[PDB]
Short mmCIF file of C-alpha atoms in Angstrom, two decimals:
data_model
loop_
_atom_site.label_atom_id
_atom_site.label_comp_id
_atom_site.label_asym_id
_atom_site.label_seq_id
_atom_site.Cartn_x
_atom_site.Cartn_y
_atom_site.Cartn_z
CA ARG A 1 -102.24 -146.05 -98.22
CA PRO A 2 -103.81 -145.49 -101.67
CA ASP A 3 -104.59 -141.86 -102.56
CA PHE A 4 -108.24 -142.80 -103.12
CA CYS A 5 -108.54 -143.30 -99.35
CA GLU A 6 -108.55 -139.51 -98.97
CA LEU A 7 -111.61 -138.99 -101.21
CA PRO A 8 -114.84 -137.86 -99.50
CA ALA A 9 -117.70 -140.32 -98.94
CA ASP A 10 -119.96 -140.26 -102.00
CA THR A 11 -123.45 -141.74 -102.03
CA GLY A 12 -123.60 -141.26 -105.80
CA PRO A 13 -126.78 -140.51 -107.78
CA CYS A 14 -128.75 -143.74 -107.30
CA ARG A 15 -131.33 -144.57 -104.64
CA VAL A 16 -130.54 -148.16 -103.62
CA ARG A 17 -129.35 -147.66 -100.06
CA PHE A 18 -126.37 -149.90 -99.23
CA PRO A 19 -124.90 -149.41 -95.77
CA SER A 20 -121.20 -149.03 -96.63
CA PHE A 21 -117.87 -147.83 -95.25
CA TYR A 22 -115.38 -145.13 -96.17
CA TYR A 23 -111.98 -144.15 -94.81
CA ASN A 24 -112.02 -140.83 -92.99
CA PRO A 25 -108.43 -139.47 -93.07
CA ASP A 26 -109.10 -136.77 -90.47
CA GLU A 27 -110.33 -139.29 -87.93
CA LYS A 28 -108.10 -142.08 -89.24
CA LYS A 29 -111.12 -144.40 -89.06
CA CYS A 30 -113.31 -146.44 -91.38
CA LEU A 31 -116.79 -145.02 -90.86
CA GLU A 32 -120.29 -145.86 -92.10
CA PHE A 33 -122.10 -144.09 -94.94
CA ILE A 34 -124.99 -144.74 -97.32
CA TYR A 35 -124.05 -145.68 -100.87
CA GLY A 36 -126.82 -145.44 -103.44
CA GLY A 37 -125.73 -148.34 -105.62
CA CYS A 38 -124.10 -146.63 -108.61
CA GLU A 39 -121.10 -144.44 -109.44
CA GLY A 40 -119.51 -142.65 -106.49
CA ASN A 41 -115.78 -143.21 -105.92
CA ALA A 42 -113.16 -145.79 -104.84
CA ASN A 43 -113.35 -144.91 -101.13
CA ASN A 44 -116.25 -147.32 -100.80
CA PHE A 45 -116.24 -150.68 -99.02
CA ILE A 46 -118.85 -153.33 -98.29
CA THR A 47 -117.55 -153.96 -94.77
CA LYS A 48 -115.54 -152.09 -92.15
CA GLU A 49 -112.98 -154.91 -92.32
CA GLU A 50 -112.40 -154.46 -96.07
CA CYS A 51 -112.00 -150.71 -95.57
CA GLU A 52 -109.53 -151.22 -92.73
CA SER A 53 -107.30 -153.61 -94.69
CA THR A 54 -107.29 -151.40 -97.78
CA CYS A 55 -107.10 -147.87 -96.32
CA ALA A 56 -106.02 -148.18 -92.69
#
């Protein structure tokens, strides 16, 4: 899997709360987090399904 899948969840600096998903390498699971709508990092998916096909 892509190296970016190991990056921590990052809500970024904005305040528009998008329920999102990130790959958690320790748990080997795509888990839910809040993304604030701007910046952050590549370990950031709009659905669990997208996260699982990219990082899992």
